[PDB]
Design a binder for this molecule. Structure first.
Ligand SMILES: Nc1ncnc2c1ncn2[C@@H]1O[C@H](CSCC[C@H](N)C(=O)O)[C@@H](O)[C@H]1O
Ligand code: NA
Lengths: 265, 265
């Protein structure tokens, strides 16, 4: 009679919490989704093995349109687990799933796990200084969206950092790279010419957060736009004015040029 | 000869990630701090029992002044772990400790854990809509902190939610409740009269996130300022312009007054 929303964490099968793993093991049915994001440091097989339960994978349509016909029915008589990468309820449409559960007379509990939102603290940037977040999306056809550019502008204008998720093609497994994201932003800067993203802008690139050997790089766009950050997923951050301690971290830990100690502080 | 920063999570010893547990079990020395946050659902004993090691708890002074004398020295020959509540680098100054580790020729790694920063997702509020964060600090003698009041104003003007970390004096076993935070805010409103935080302001309270039964409440200050939300830790959130689905969740899951369903766009 219970539904558990369990986060799988950041990168591999060991990123789930002890509580989440033990609970998942005692569930009769286990579902999961990998359309909001993917566990690049592992496989479905490794996760199934660790849990010892068959994992029924669900698509975006399965979740958004038929959650109540696929998941909730089984929760009426058994304990069901729903696994998602990161922290449950972070993906904007997932909170609503708990309402569907209530309507179905099904109890639901949330088992947290690490999220990129909190994991970006490894960049040395103070968490309280982050402002609104955005997603960099690929233009397509006659559609050229640029809201993510305005978000950076609103934040930087107030001395706040901007966390940028990069467009992902879940099923086609086609991730947008930090390099690609920078190119798009430079192109958006050439149209709106607001002086928000240029070759002199300082950015931070975080890749494979959660891994024991993540890639943390900071520098000006002109030097990082062609650098190789490794395998996805990539996260882009456009910092606002830095606190000296933030700058010292980016320099000592993320190889940023000493120049930021005077230009961006 | 390495140093591991390992987060313990939100509420109890099971909120640690499997990755963190397996590594912590193999460290020669284990240190920790419990002044940056409160893990209401566990004890040092349970943690030690789960990890199978004795944990030397450090005070804020031991850490902020003598980290390189108490911890780093051992890391130069043994595998050392440093445990903290939630995620080690979120809303703390522990990131700077990685710089010290580096300067002393000690490699460090970070194992994330669920954090209050991403756990706000359980409130139903879109996490991408959160703006700058702030801390409601206890007034000290004649010094009365107010900066956190201007943060709410800045975000509200932009329609962004505001996450408010609540103060803590671990050495005195004092943990600010949401009620206390609301009282301090009304007092600041009385001084500045910016129409930022009044008895008609809608607020959200999340208490003991990470537990199976956290307290999630939403409503007007006048009605919530004297309500009992259970034991600490608590966080206070001042939402901005709400999406309809955010409001539906606050009402259906957080017991908010059906009135907020009628959103003014
Ligand atoms: N489980 C929990 N529930 C509610 N608030 C919490 C909480 N854990 C931390 N907080 C809030 O955050 C403050 C500590 S700030 C340090 C946060 C920690 N590194 C993390 O990642 O969560 C507390 O005083 C409280 O206001
Ligand atoms: Na944020």
């Amino acid at each position: 009679m219970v539904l558990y929303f369990i986060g799988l964490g950041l990168y591999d099968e060991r990123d789930i919490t002890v509580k989440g793993l033990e609970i998942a093991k005692k569930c009769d049915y286990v579902f999961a989704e990998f359309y909001t994001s993917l566990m690049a440091g592992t496989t479905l097989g490794r996760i199934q093995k660790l849990i010892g339960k068959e994992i029924r994978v669900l698509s975006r349509e399965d979740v958004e349109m038929n959650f109540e016909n696929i998941v909730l029915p089984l929760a009426k008589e058994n304990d069901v687990a729903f696994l998602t990468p990161g922290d449950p309820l972070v993906a904007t449409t997932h909170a609503e799933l708990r309402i569907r559960a209530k309507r179905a007379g099904v109890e639901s509990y949330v088992i947290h796990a690490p999220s990129i939102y909190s994991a970006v603290g490894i960049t040395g940037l103070h968490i309280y200084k982050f402002g609104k977040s955005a997603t960099v999306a690929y233009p397509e056809g006659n559609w050229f969206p640029t809201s993510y550019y305005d978000v950076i502008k609103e934040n930087a204008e107030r001395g706040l950092h901007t966390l940028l998720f990069l467009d992902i093609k879940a099923e086609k497994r086609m991730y947008m790279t930090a390099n690609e994201a920078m190119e798009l932003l430079l192109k958006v800067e050439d149209m709106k010419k607001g002086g928000v993203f240029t070759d002199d802008t300082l950015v931070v690139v975080l890749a494979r957060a959660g891994s024991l050997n993540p890639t943390i790089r900071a520098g000006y766009v002109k030097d990082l736009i062609r650098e190789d950050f490794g395998d996805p997923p990539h996260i882009l951050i456009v910092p606002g004015k830095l606190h000296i301690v933030e700058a010292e971290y980016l320099v000592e830990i993320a190889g940023a040029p000493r120049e930021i100690l005077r230009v961006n502080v």
